[PDB]
Amino acid sequence: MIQRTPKIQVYSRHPAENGKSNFLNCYVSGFHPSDIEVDLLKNGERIEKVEHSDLSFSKDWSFYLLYYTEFTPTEKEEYACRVNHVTLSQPKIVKWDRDM
């Protein structure tokens, strides 16, 4: 058996073909087992509609998840990603730095 804690990155991207659009991204990388729970948060509340959830693996024991959706952030709002995994005794919350 092997288990590996996910690395978690939270960042925003504008698709170059539609630059007014903005996407909040949680990239959860290098984890095993693949069982996982991932949410985007707005002011601490789960965002129910997340339009993209893309799972892959490299080696049979290394999984990657890109969890992302369109958003419209204001300077006062706080966004984050919350991850639950067997390796994480408490849910891990990684805040969006709004300059990322």
Residue numbers in the entry: 0 to 99
Give verbatim lines from the article.
To examine the structural effect of other amino acid substitutions at this site, the crystal structures of seven variants (D76E-, D76A-, D76S-, D76G-, D76Q-, D76Y-, and D76K-β2m) were determined at high resolution (1.15 to 1.52 Å). Comparison of the crystal structures of D76E-, D76A-, D76S-, D76G-, D76Q-, D76Y-, and D76K-β2m with those of WT- and D76N-β2m revealed no substantial differences that could explain their different stabilities and aggregation propensities (RMSD < 0.6 Å over all heavy atoms). In WT-β2m, a salt bridge is formed between the negatively charged residue Asp-76 and the highly conserved Lys41. This interaction is preserved in D76E-β2m and may explain, at least in part, the protection of β2m from aggregation for these two proteins. Indeed, a recent study has highlighted the importance of this salt bridge for D76N-β2m stability and aggregation. A second group of residues, with a significantly reduced score compared to Asp76, includes the D76E- and D76A-β2m variants (∼ 400 AUC [P = 0.01 compared with WT-β2m]), while a third group contains the remaining 17 D76X-β2m variants, which have significantly decreased scores (P = 0.003 compared with D76E/A-β2m). Overall, the results show that the presence of a negatively charged Asp protects β2m from aggregation, at least as judged by the TPBLA, with the negatively charged D76E-β2m or neutral D76A-β2m providing some, albeit more limited, protection as judged by this assay. The native Asp was most protective, Glu and Ala showed some protection, and all other residues (including Asn) resulted in a low in vivo growth score when introduced at this site.
